[PDB]
């Protein structure tokens, strides 16, 4: 299987959390992923949103295409995703100022809104914690990533997958997700595939052009399954941990297959501030950055 561990209420940096810190860096750069273990309010709202994006799939679709801005890439597209960003009304001046993907969410319905919005506050603990347990882990100053997140671009993709409706199992290809760590939740039925670091493996850089991650390694073993288990989320990095710690941590490659059963699932991305530049921890004196605003409307 793959390692279950615990996080604290609050990471203080103490002998505790960085030892959990160097296990989070190891079962990375092992399995390429882990699980931490959600208690009774962290399951209870993670079931309460997977409720609310069941309740909308099954409307019309003549609805779910109102559910769409033409300021943010939140909203509904047909798997079928529903995006929830940052939720701007027109009232905040980044809206006015006309900042690209700011503006408001498309709601289907309040109650959507608050059981989604609760749900991506108690995300938004889970992964400072995970980022300031990986900087003690890296032996890095533990507000070292969470100094980029400060009113962080976080956002959500929150998925359903249909049944295998052909003779093709296909959901999505093989792909890195382009931001720092991403925190995926999923029901019973189940259908994520991730790929471990494999040594000696060369692994494109997404962040660059003419070094795209996408459909890599898609036919090519290994892909560890990620079972359906109860009450956890599976973590695992992203792109922009993969340039900030110059490789030390791959971004996790995962692809989706469908089930014979209607699939729902989460995918949370905790993210540096709309205006941030990420920087590679190790090579202080390269020039490289990623600013983390024209880096999401590119990937996007
Ligand atoms: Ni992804």
């Known amino acids: 299987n793959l390692q279950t561990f615990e996080l604290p209420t609050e990471v203080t940096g103490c002998a505790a959390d960085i030892s959990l810190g160097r296990a989070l860096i190891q079962a990375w750069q092992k399995d390429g992923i882990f699980q931490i ?23 019309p679709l ?5 559910c769409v801005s033409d300021l943010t890439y939140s909203g509904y597209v047909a798997p079928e995703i529903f995006t929830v960003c940052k939720d701007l009304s027109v009232g905040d001046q980044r809206v ?7 503006g408001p969410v498309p709601w289907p319905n309040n ?10 506050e108690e995300l938004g603990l889970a992964g400072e914690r995970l980022l300031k347990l ?5 032996e890095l100053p533990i507000n070292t990533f969470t100094d980029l997140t400060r009113d962080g671009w976080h956002h959500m993709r929150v998925l359903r997958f249909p049944p295998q409706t052909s003779t093709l199992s296909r959901g999505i290809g093989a792909h890195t997700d382009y931001g720092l760590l991403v925190i995926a939740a999923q029901d019973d039925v189940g259908g994520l595939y991730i790929r471990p670091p494999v040594e000696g493996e060369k692994r ?28 956890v989320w599976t973590v695992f990095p992203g ?21 014979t059963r209607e699939r729902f699932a989460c995918a949370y991305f905790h993210e540096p501030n709309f205006e941030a530049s990420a920087y590679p921890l190790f090579e202080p004196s390269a020039n490289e950055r990623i600013h983390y605003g024209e880096h999401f409307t ?3």
Request: glycine letters at 6%; aromatic letters at 12%; charged letters at 20%.
């Open 37 to 59: 273990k959600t208690d009774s309010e962290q399951d209870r709202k993670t079931q309460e949103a997977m409720a609310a994006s069941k309740q909308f799939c099954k409307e």
């Open 62 to 66: 003549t609805f779910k295409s109102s």
């Open 96 to 102: 006015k100022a006309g900042w690209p993907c700011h």
């Open 111 to 120: 109650t959507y809104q608050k059981s989604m919005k609760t749900f991506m």
């Open 134 to 138: 990986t900087a003690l882990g890296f």
């Open 204 to 231: 494109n850089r997404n962040w660059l052009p003419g070094e795209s991650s996408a459909g890599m390694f898609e036919h090519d073993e290994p892909w560890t399954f990620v079972t359906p288990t109860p009450g």
């Open 239 to 259: 792109d922009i941990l993969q340039f900030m710690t110059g490789g030390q941590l791959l971004s996790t490659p995962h692809k989706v297959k469908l089930n």
């Open 298 to 300: 590119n990937m996007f």
